[PDB]
């Protein structure tokens, strides 16, 4: 039985036929569909690697009655099916022994570790390149002239698009609070900057329309905002 099952059958459930030899040997190869639970580490999404473990072992027997021996140190892949999305980097078998609270004897087990990788072309051609594209517009709004009067529209569109991308990708990755995905942090960072951009641009837009007969205050402002322009390498009138 495998100790790492989640919503599935523990032991083999098909019970197909087996092979005997004249010396007493017996060989049995049942097929099965196993459902394990491995900690999907999503940090370098999508350039990701997954280290998933399965743990087979006896249940009602000890090393003093049954002993396991791995025939092949590696998993055979002569009949493997290329999933198109995932490729197996390696599959290692390890023979271990433990001791539980129930009992006194030690119990053997075999741990298979699959280290696999994701082919990145799909998510880099359909998910991250559009958001990385539309994030390259948050700096664009300031260059747009003030009097035209559509800057707030661009800012709102960018912010809502970033929010949509963020709430979309929150589904595709696990809600594990042990680590944060990199793309999520980047998008939230861009949201912080775009929100900041919209408040500073509404500030400057209010500075634009204000009339001389209401908000004159010409003493302190002219001395400073008419001599920085040379420092900023821009021509005067």
């Amino acid at each position: 039985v495998l100790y790492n099952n989640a919503d599935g059958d523990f032991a083999v459930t098909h019970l197909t036929k087996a092979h005997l030899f004249h010396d007493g040997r017996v060989q049995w190869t049942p097929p099965a569909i196993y459902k394990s639970s491995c900690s999907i580490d999503v940090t370098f999404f999508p350039f990701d690697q997954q280290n998933c473990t399965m743990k087979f072992g006896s249940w009602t027997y000890d090393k003093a009655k049954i002993d396991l021996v791995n025939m092949h140190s590696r998993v055979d892949q002569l009949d493997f099916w290329e999933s198109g999305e995932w490729v197996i980097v390696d599959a290692v078998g390890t023979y271990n022994t433990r001791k539980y609270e129930c009992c006194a004897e030690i119990y053997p087990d075999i741990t298979y570790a699959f280290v696999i990788r994701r082919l990145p072309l799909f998510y880099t051609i359909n998910l991250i390149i559009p958001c990385l594209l539309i994030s390259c517009l948050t700096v664009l709004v300031f260059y747009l002239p003030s009097e035209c009067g559509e800057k707030i529209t661009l800012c709102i569109s960018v912010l809502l698009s970033l929010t949509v991308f963020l709430l979309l990708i929150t589904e595709i990755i696990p809600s594990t609070s042990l680590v944060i995905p990199l793309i999520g942090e980047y998008l939230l960072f861009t949201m912080i900057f775009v929100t900041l951009s919209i408040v500073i641009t509404v500030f400057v837009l209010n500075v634009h329309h204000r009339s001389p007969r209401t908000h004159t205050m010409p003493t302190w402002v002219r001395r400073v905002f008419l001599d920085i322009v040379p420092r900023l390498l821009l021509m005067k009138r």
């Binding site: 609070s177 944060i180 929100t195 209010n206 009339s211 007969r213």
Partner: protein, 186 residues
Amino acid sequence: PSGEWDIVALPGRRNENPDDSTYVDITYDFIIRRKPLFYTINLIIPCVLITSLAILVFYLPSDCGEKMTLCISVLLALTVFLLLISKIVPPTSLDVPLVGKYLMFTMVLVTFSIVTSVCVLNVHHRSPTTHTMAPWVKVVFLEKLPALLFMQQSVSEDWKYVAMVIDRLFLWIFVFVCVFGTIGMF
């Protein structure tokens, strides 16, 4: 280790009903604590990020003609977050999540902001030739102006000044009530 969820303690107690004299059972209780970092960085940050625009809207000058766009956009974003946070919470009408209550209050606030914004926008574009109404407004607003610590000073400009004064007033009282609304979260 489970990852997102953390266990605290596992009490286990034998329940016995002395009145039925037949009922026995063992009840285990699991007290599980959610690690907050994920939902904090994915659900609370956008909310607190977009909720400031609700009061930010007024500082936009009326002559630009864009208050409607920003205000409706804020309202729509709040409705989206409200529906999402309602779809993620179990549909139990026994209690209300705190984030939902905060969203509903700030939505009422912004839908009051939209109507006061259309009011100021209407009182701005009046022409000095049609809606004079001088005596009842001149003295009252020239007296009100110092009560806001605002700078001092052809009637179209006067209506513009009036609109600026009143929406500055609303911005003051709006931020003053939003501070108390944020305090009410604690």
